[PDB]
Amino acid sequence: GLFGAIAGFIEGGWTGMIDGWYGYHHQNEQGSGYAADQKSTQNAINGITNKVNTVIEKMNIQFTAVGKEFNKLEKRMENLNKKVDDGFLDIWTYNAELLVLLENERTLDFHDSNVKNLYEKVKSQLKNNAKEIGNGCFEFYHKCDNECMESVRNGTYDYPKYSEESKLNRE
Amino acid sequence: GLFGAIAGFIEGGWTGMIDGWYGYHHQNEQGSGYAADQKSTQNAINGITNKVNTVIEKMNIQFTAVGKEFNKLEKRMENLNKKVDDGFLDIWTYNAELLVLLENERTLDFHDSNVKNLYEKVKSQLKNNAKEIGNGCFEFYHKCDNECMESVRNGTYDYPKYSEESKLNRE
Amino acid sequence: GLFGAIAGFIEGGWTGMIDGWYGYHHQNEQGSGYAADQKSTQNAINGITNKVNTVIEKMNIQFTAVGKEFNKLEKRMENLNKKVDDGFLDIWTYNAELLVLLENERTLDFHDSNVKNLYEKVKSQLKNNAKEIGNGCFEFYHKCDNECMESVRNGTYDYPKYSEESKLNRE
Amino acid sequence: APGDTICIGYHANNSTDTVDTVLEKNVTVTHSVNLLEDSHNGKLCRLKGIAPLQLGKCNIAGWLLGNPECDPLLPVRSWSYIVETPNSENGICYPGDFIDYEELREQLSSVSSFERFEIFPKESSWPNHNTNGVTAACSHEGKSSFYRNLLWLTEKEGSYPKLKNSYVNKKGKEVLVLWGIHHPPNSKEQQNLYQNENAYVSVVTSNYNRRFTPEIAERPKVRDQAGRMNYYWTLLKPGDTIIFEANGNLIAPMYAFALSRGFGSGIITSNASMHECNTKCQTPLGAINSSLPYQNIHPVTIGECPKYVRSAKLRMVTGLRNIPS
Amino acid sequence: APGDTICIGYHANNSTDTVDTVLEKNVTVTHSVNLLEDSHNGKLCRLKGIAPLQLGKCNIAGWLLGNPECDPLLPVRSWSYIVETPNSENGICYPGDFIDYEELREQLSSVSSFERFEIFPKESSWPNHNTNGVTAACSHEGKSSFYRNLLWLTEKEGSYPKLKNSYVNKKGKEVLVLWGIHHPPNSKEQQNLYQNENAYVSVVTSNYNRRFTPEIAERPKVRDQAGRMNYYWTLLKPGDTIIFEANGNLIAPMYAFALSRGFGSGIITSNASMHECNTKCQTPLGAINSSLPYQNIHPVTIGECPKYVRSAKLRMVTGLRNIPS
Amino acid sequence: APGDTICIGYHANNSTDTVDTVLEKNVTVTHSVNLLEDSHNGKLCRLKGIAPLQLGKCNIAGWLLGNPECDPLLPVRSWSYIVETPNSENGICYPGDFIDYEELREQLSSVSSFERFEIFPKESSWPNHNTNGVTAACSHEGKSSFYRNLLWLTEKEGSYPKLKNSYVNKKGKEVLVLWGIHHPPNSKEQQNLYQNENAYVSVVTSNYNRRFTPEIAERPKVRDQAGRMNYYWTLLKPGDTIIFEANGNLIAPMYAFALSRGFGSGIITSNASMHECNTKCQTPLGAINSSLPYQNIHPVTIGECPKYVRSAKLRMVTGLRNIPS
Ligand SMILES: CN(C)[C@H]1CCN([S@@](=O)(F)=Nc2cc(Cl)c(C(=O)N3CCO[C@@H](c4ccccc4)C3)c(Cl)c2)C1
Ligand SMILES: CN(C)[C@H]1CCN([S@@](=O)(F)=Nc2cc(Cl)c(C(=O)N3CCO[C@@H](c4ccccc4)C3)c(Cl)c2)C1
Ligand SMILES: CN(C)[C@H]1CCN([S@@](=O)(F)=Nc2cc(Cl)c(C(=O)N3CCO[C@@H](c4ccccc4)C3)c(Cl)c2)C1
Ligand SMILES: *[C@@H]1O[C@H](CO)[C@@H](O[C@@H]2O[C@H](CO)[C@@H](O)[C@H](O)[C@H]2NC(C)=O)[C@H](O)[C@H]1NC(C)=O
Ligand SMILES: *[C@@H]1O[C@H](CO)[C@@H](O[C@@H]2O[C@H](CO)[C@@H](O)[C@H](O)[C@H]2NC(C)=O)[C@H](O)[C@H]1NC(C)=O
Ligand SMILES: *[C@@H]1O[C@H](CO)[C@@H](O[C@@H]2O[C@H](CO)[C@@H](O)[C@H](O)[C@H]2NC(C)=O)[C@H](O)[C@H]1NC(C)=O
Ligand SMILES: *[C@@H]1O[C@H](CO)[C@@H](O)[C@H](O)[C@H]1NC(C)=O
Ligand SMILES: *[C@@H]1O[C@H](CO)[C@@H](O)[C@H](O)[C@H]1NC(C)=O
Ligand SMILES: *[C@@H]1O[C@H](CO)[C@@H](O)[C@H](O)[C@H]1NC(C)=O
Ligand SMILES: *[C@@H]1O[C@H](CO)[C@@H](O)[C@H](O)[C@H]1NC(C)=O
Ligand SMILES: *[C@@H]1O[C@H](CO)[C@@H](O)[C@H](O)[C@H]1NC(C)=O
Ligand SMILES: *[C@@H]1O[C@H](CO)[C@@H](O)[C@H](O)[C@H]1NC(C)=O
Ligand SMILES: *[C@@H]1O[C@H](CO)[C@@H](O)[C@H](O)[C@H]1NC(C)=O
Ligand SMILES: *[C@@H]1O[C@H](CO)[C@@H](O)[C@H](O)[C@H]1NC(C)=O
Ligand SMILES: *[C@@H]1O[C@H](CO)[C@@H](O)[C@H](O)[C@H]1NC(C)=O
């Protein structure tokens, strides 16, 4: 994608994460499991919902539109009516398909941007207390329990708390 | 935003910076103050100005457009005229609103990209002579005066000049 | 650009690289030369080709469209016909120019994103076995021959193989 | 042990939905929304609680003139749209021209109700004139008949007196008056029916003023008739008077229609059948129950409908690129 | 001491402007540009230095025929657009049909100037005919009158001679000629005014050729008149000749209009008043002074105007998301 | 030694192509695609292997009536579009009105072929009538002549018998019949040619029914003619009969056209010349050989053409920003 996260340095998606679009997978001595990031997932839901509603709202309700009749001496007016109907139909078909195509590319990139931002948010939180082992994973230089994992999942990781430990393992 | 800078890892904007859209705030022994980046601010002005003018230029001047009259035996032609007028009005209202909406999202992301690029430009200049203290700030590992600050604001930071000092403070 | 690579931290393009849009330039004891990245170049070709074909396909074939004649007592119908023809012409000219402009900005950013992703892909492969010397170049902390260079150009760089050497030169 | 790890990832599932983008087609994604409606119930339904007017075997011309082969409707009807069957076997049955017929159709497109009433009672309005004229062109149960809303005036006892009849519109709504003009194929028939050669018909209102004269000539037979009947109409405003004056050839009105105006109506041709259903959107193929913005069912729509497009598919992605591997 | 610091940031201010995007609505931003014009001065102005033609109490039909209740304009006028008041109490005053009236309106939409001149002088062109005919339908100051541009020809001393009058267009521009045809309600009035029963009117030019015959019938009274006057017109090309021939019922032209063609003009209905102002863009609600591309004031525009849209707001963001906290 | 290096970069070349974007104009790029076609061969070509119908000096009216100054075409022609030269010096040569002329043009826009045949043979269909009438208005080689498809019927030996002629359409296709009505400028000429004052012309089919009467008046001379000839037409359906009845003033049909319907045709005005070439797209300026979606050559198109736009340039970028420095 455009931001290099989805189908990029994070190769695949997680079937085990059913709660949200983005989230975390942890592995410590207490166990392992998936956990979605509610803040970023909820934000992406609202924007896309407004985005869907925007497309539907821009299209007005099609009120009654019927054919008309012309006698054998009104072929010019009949053809003008056909030219009007076809012309408007040509434009609206062009607008509908193009808007969906253009907006679909934007949605995929919007998700791609969100994954990278979430990955970068954790990276700046951990600093050198963990190491980037690729594929969007961090290997901690210190013991990190469920309480510590939760502090990474939200934005309250205490870097000075584990810095002294992490330096020793990093050596 | 899309690039994670505005309303992202730089949480807020500066009311004290009145010169430009983007810039720097410095703190050394000589004092402190705000300073806009003229190069990136001027570039963003020109692009957005061309972008505004592009939208206005694409809309042609609406020359004279008035109503027409039809007698009681020309209801078909009258309705066709109404169908034409309403149809064109439907399309132009749809085009105007959608273009503004689509372009507004692009402008916000364009500013978001510019902030990140400016932040990344300074980061590659400083390298390890300073430390990322978060919120878009760098803490120097060396004394940096007004002349040194100006060298960061433009693209002429001398990394070897302060590398030996910075290594000692970094220890 | 939007992603900061083209006309950004990689200042210029390579006239010596004729094979592809993106690629590598290497310098070791065996010589030097240009080499395009076939994977990312081919991917960008296919997307842009589909993108060009999408624009052409959305425009239907213009079938026969000719003028009509009206007598001296049909000026109203003649003006309505002119209003229809001009109105449709106004819309299609607006659509064609705007779509090209909007899509041109997307293409330039799409190339800009690709260069950054390729640069970031190599950076995560090399880690600290090389140093970012700016302008999109990496200076190896170890001897890297043609076989080693090819392993960087594809995605099979063996970091543990040269880590011990690189640490000594990095000291 | 390698140590404790944290990982950033994105959702995937078993969805097989695909969308197209500008850069790449046929992208499997986790979630998507269809925006194109293609389903209808295949029935003719009531619109906003109001049933349409089904003319059955008649077209507009056949119903307005009162073709005897069509089942007569109730004297008062109210509808939301008008349905004509594709095979309207009954229209004009005596050959001729229906002047401004198409304009009258567009007038009826904004009509919500009619009342059929005797503007000129048969046995009260035409003394000294025979009113029993029929023709094999408009047959009914194998016998010659005539329009239910018109009266063929002919000579009575060797004479056709100059008639002068008028009606004042006291219904409070516009009244649609239809009449015909007969053109015999030879002057011998002109005398036999109307006893005058220089016959004429005059119809006047406050805003209508026209005079008709017979044109006599041999013509090709149409429906076994070499004569022609030209049909005319006008809308009589509330409080206005229509005056008929003739000394021959007038196919006099007998019934007229008091009309009410409405919104959102129209005339459609449908093969479908009436059902006990209600819809906010009706097409000649069927009724649509959708909040989607687009539809590719039919361009002819009645009510509140999605916009018709030629597209085969319009799917907007909401989720991510689906990579369950 | 922590040490010296450098920081990257973005501008913020006290702006309260909001814009909408596809992903999110009501975004407060630092800078923005309004693209939708909604302000007008509420006056009728000169267009590119040229004043419009205000018909006052008359509509087009009332001015062209010369309704006596309307203030007469100067013999020569030049304008940029035509204004009709919403309450045009004066139009056709003798009941009848104005044939091709709408087409004549569209012709006048491209006319920039007129000269009113006597095509057929009153006391020179019609000897042996009475020209003083008036009617209570076209009243003036409580007394019966007639159109200022037409002449009611009647019998003189028991006879109505066959008139033959012609005019050669030597003005160098197209000349608009209007005339009427009177239809008495009974043949007794036909003899009293025109002394002939089989009357006719002939009007011919190089490209116009029409014949008119009276149609006599009792009609409902309109404006206390059971007779009817049908009004006709044609455009006489430069150098062409128009010939009038009649033996009754001709409402002869007396004044005609030499017309100049123009661009960008039109006919609008406005309640607004003329003011000493100049504009490049005029609407029935008022004049617009704007370089913005869109406007939601009115779809009817004269001159160089922004494109009308139904939108309530069109604001484009130029600055950043405003975060002064 | 500094050590071994690897670098990431992008392509550049000597291209000078420029495109515009929303943020910035005149961007030099490495690769691009032109989408706007502006080249044509400047010739009139065959369309899908079928040559157009070139009328030469005639317009539609001149060819259909058979103006004698135009080179006669083959009795059978088939074409893909119709070409009229900008200077059509030959149209209607006897002054008059061509009723519904524009409607007949639109009918011919869907016609693919004609067969010209003698509907009423000259020396077989009109006994007791003179058929040699000519006029200086329609001259040929300096001598008076007449339309090639019509016949001026006049009196023979002091009398004009009431003619009654009919034709049954047995061609299996629609047949276009044209006739004229002559209007003498004075009653003296009416007797000299037609021997009757109350003359009339009757033309009837299954769906056509019209009667014509001469209108006699002095008129301005047009092409040195004070008389007028009104031209009329109708389309005779397969198997139908047309009956002509007159006792004067009928300009009888002599030749008629059996027509075949087609698709994608039309009438265009072109200064260009026919060439031995084939194209899928033809404009009045020339033929287009392009697979591009847009063109700024001409809005009038025949065949399968790019969409006309007013743009001067439409270039889509495919490569990168070109930075060879
Ligand atoms: C048809 N119309 C009447 C319109 C009218 C308005 N829209 S609407 O905006 F609500 N549409 C949608 C908008 C969206 Cl965001 C989504 C969507 O991806 N998910 C919504 C639920 O959490 C997502 C999820 C993530 C991870 C795991 C599980 C689940 C899935 C969908 Cl499926 C539809 C419909
Ligand atoms: C109405 N029309 C006739 C059109 C016709 C053309 N446009 S035009 O392109 F010039 N519009 C604008 C274009 C822009 Cl970039 C801006 C804009 O954000 N700033 C411009 C001044 O420095 C910015 C600034 C930054 C930081 C601190 C202080 C100031 C603010 C604005 Cl306010 C308007 C108007
Ligand atoms: C006119 N129409 C009929 C349409 C119909 C469809 N299109 S089409 O999509 F094929 N157009 C193009 C699409 C593209 Cl990607 C390109 C393009 O940049 N390169 C294609 C070849 O490798 C690129 C290259 C890179 C580096 C070095 C050398 C070369 C150049 C071009 Cl020049 C055209 C044309
Ligand atoms: C972020 O996550 C951390 C980790 O759990 C939360 O901090 C703990 O919250 C629990 C509440 O159940 C307390 O019992 C612990 O003492 C807290 N530990 C620390 C180190 O603070 C924190 O509250 C979360 N922040 C939120 C949800 O805003
Ligand atoms: C970038 O900023 C630096 C820091 O001020 C500028 O370098 C100094 O410029 C002043 C000119 O007033 C000289 O007196 C100093 O001697 C310069 N110092 C050094 C270390 O060069 C530099 O000129 C600026 N570059 C620009 C503006 O392009
Ligand atoms: C990626 O590049 C490396 C470097 O050349 C390839 O590995 C070598 O491939 C050659 C084949 O010619 C072998 O002879 C060498 O022994 C390989 N060396 C190593 C260290 O594996 C590798 O095959 C490439 N991968 C691809 C093309 O998928
Ligand atoms: C996905 O799995 C669910 C099981 O919950 C099943 O009901 C559904 O049909 C599956 N869909 C596809 C497309 O396989
Ligand atoms: C679209 O993708 C699906 C999943 O890979 C595949 O089954 C299908 O055939 C594709 N459609 C095409 C290539 O037209
Ligand atoms: C129309 O759709 C709504 C929305 O689901 C549904 O509740 C209702 O039953 C439907 N009515 C029909 C199908 O008649
Ligand atoms: C912003 O502050 C300025 C003071 O310079 C004041 O004039 C202006 O009205 C303020 N605007 C808003 C929206 O508060
Ligand atoms: C838009 O945002 C402003 C500022 O927060 C707020 O005052 C206003 O009420 C909002 N409008 C809405 C929510 O409609
Ligand atoms: C029209 O707008 C311009 C631009 O500000 C202004 O200078 C001029 O005075 C205005 N004219 C009016 C309001 O009549
Ligand atoms: C680029 O160089 C090639 C040489 O291969 C030459 O043929 C071509 O004309 C040049 N184009 C431009 C724009 O200089
Ligand atoms: C566009 O750019 C080219 C290359 O720099 C230049 O030669 C040309 O003059 C430019 N066109 C303009 C500025 O209109
Ligand atoms: C039309 O264009 C095609 C595509 O290049 C070409 O092969 C053909 O020769 C052209 N025909 C002409 C110019 O007549």
Q: Tell me if B32 sits within 8 A of B142, measured CB to CB.
A: no
| b/e per residue D69-83 (b: at least 16 CB within 10 A) | ebeeeeeeeebbbbb
Pairing of strands F32-34, F315-317: antiparallel
Cβ-based neighbours of C53, under 8 Å, separated by 6 or more: none
Q: Which residue has the tokens 């009837």?
A: F204
Residues of D with CB under 8 A from a CB of C: 22-25
- Structure tokens belonging to residue E84: 């009709």
Residue A61: what residue type?
A: I
Encoded tokens for A10: 């994070």
Q: Which residue of B lies nearest to E304 if distances are taken between CA atoms?
A: B63
- C-alpha distances (whole Å) from C83 to each of C45, D40, E110 are 42, 36, 15
- Shortest distance between the Cα of C71 and any Cα of chain E, in A, equals 11
Say which residues have a Cβ less than 8 Å from residue E170's Cβ, sequence separation at least 6. Answer: E239
Distances (CA, A) of D65 to A76, D224, D232, D234: 29, 20, 10, 13
Positive or negative, the CA dihedral E264, E269, E275, E279 is negative
CB contacts < 8 A (B, C): 42
Residue C137 domain-assigned (yes or no): no
**Contact criterion met (CB below 8 Å) for E55 and E27:** no
Domains assigned to chain E: 1-39+290-325 (2.10.77.10), 45-269 (3.90.209.20)
H or E element, residue F234 = strand F228-236
Please enumerate in sequence order all residues whose Cβ is within 8 A of that of F127, keeping only pairs 6 or more positions apart, or say none: none
Report the DSSP pairing between strands D53-54 and D82-84: parallel
Counted domains in chain C: 1
3-state class (DSSP) for residue D239:
coil
Q: Element (H or E) spanning E28, and its range?
A: strand E27-28
Q: Do E209 and F220 touch (CB under 8 A)?
A: no
User: Starting at the edge strand that comes first in sequence, how are the strands of the sheet with F36-37 ordered?
Assistant: F36-37, F294-295, F307-308
Collapsing DSSP states into helix, strand and coil, what is residue F233?
A: strand
In DSSP notation, D198-222 reads: S--EEEE-SS-EEEE---------B
Which residue, F96, F122, F131, is CA-closest to F214? F96
CA angle in degrees (0–180, nearest 5) for D239-D240-D241: 130
Under DSSP, the state recorded for B65 is B
| Structure tokens given for A131 | 């190491």
Query: With an 8 Å Cβ cutoff, is B95 touching chain C?
Result: yes
User: For residues D88 and D57, is the Cβ–Cβ distance under 8 A?
Assistant: yes
Of E103, E207, E235, the CB nearest to C76: E103
CATH of the domain at B96: 3.90.20.10
Token pair belonging to C21: 């849009």
Which residues from F are below 8 Å from A when comparing CB atoms?
Answer: 100, 102-103, 106-107, 207, 235
Helical ranges in C59-158 per DSSP H:
75-126, 146-153
* Neighbouring residues of C101: CB distance < 8 A, sequence distance ≥ 6: B54, F20, F21, F22
C-alpha span between D322 and D28 (Å, rounded): 6
Phi first, then psi: what are they for E71, rounded to 5°?
-65, 125
Question: Looking at ligand 3, which residue's alpha carbon is closest to its atom 27?
Answer: C20
For ligand 10, atom 5, the nearest C-alpha belongs to E14
Residue C32 included in any domain: yes
* CA distances to D149, E127, E149, E239, F121 from E121, in Å: 54, 11, 11, 20, 55
For residue C58, the enclosing domain spans 23-127
Going from the C-alpha of F237 to that of each of D229, F118, F167, F207, F263, the distances in angstroms are 20, 17, 12, 9, 19
Q: Does C11 map to a domain?
A: no
Enter the tokens of residue D60: 């507009």
Which residue, D234, D217, D252, is CA-closest to D146?
D252
Query: Chain E residue closest to F221 (CA)?
Result: E206
Decide the pairing of beta strands D294-295 and D36-37.
parallel
The C-alpha angle B52, B57, B59, rounded to 5 degrees, equals 110
Cα separation, F62 vs F75, whole angstroms: 16
User: Three-state SS for C81?
Assistant: helix
Q: Does the CA dihedral F276-F277-F282-F287 come out positive or negative? A: negative
Q: What's the count of helices (H) and strands (E) in chain B, helices before strands?
A: 4, 4
- Closest residue on chain A to B5 (Cα): A117
Q: Which residues lie below 8 Å from residue B154, measured CB to CB, with a gap of 6+? A: none
Question: Is B20 within a domain?
Answer: no
Structure tokens at F101: 């002329």
CA F318–ligand 3 middle distance (angstroms): 7
Q: Specify the experimental method.
A: X-ray
Query: Which pair of structure tokens corresponds to residue F121?
Result: 């043979």
Touching chains, F (3+ CB pairs < 8 A) = A, B, C, D, E
Contacts of C134 (CB under 8 A, 6+ apart): B124, C9
By CB atoms closer than 10 A (0-12, 13-18, 19+), residue E73 is middle
CB contact under 8 A, E106 and C74: no
Comparing CA positions, the residue from D282, D271, D311 lying closest to residue D40 is D282
Q: How far apart are CA C136 and CA C114, in angstroms?
A: 13
CB D202, CB D244: distance < 8 Å: yes
Cβ of residue B17 lying under 6 Å from some atom of ligand 2: no
- Is the Cβ atom of F15 under 6 angstroms away from ligand 14? no
Cβ of residue C108 closer than 8 Å to a chain D Cβ: no
CB contact under 8 A, A48 and E24: no
Contact A36, A45 (CB under 8 A): no
Q: Copy the structure tokens of residue D249.
A: 């050839």
Cα E40 to Cα E62, E256, E273, E318, distances in angstroms: 31, 38, 14, 26
Whether the CB of B2 is below 8 Å from some CB of chain E: the reply is no
Helix (H/G/I), strand (E/B), else coil: A38: helix
Neighbours of F90 (CB within 10 A): 20
Distance (Å, whole) CA E180 – CA E191: 18
Model resolution, angstroms: 2.3
Rounded-to-integer distance, Cα F224 and Cα D58, Å: 55
Q: For residue F318, is it left (φ>0), alpha (ψ between -120 and 50) or beta?
A: alpha
Give the C-alpha separation, B75 to D259, whole Å.
Answer: 17
| Ligand 5 centroid distance, CA of B151 (Å) | 7
Residue at B113 is within a domain: yes
Q: Work out whether strand E44-47 and strand E274-279 pair parallel, antiparallel, or are unpaired.
A: parallel
Dist CA D13 CA C170 (whole Å): 45
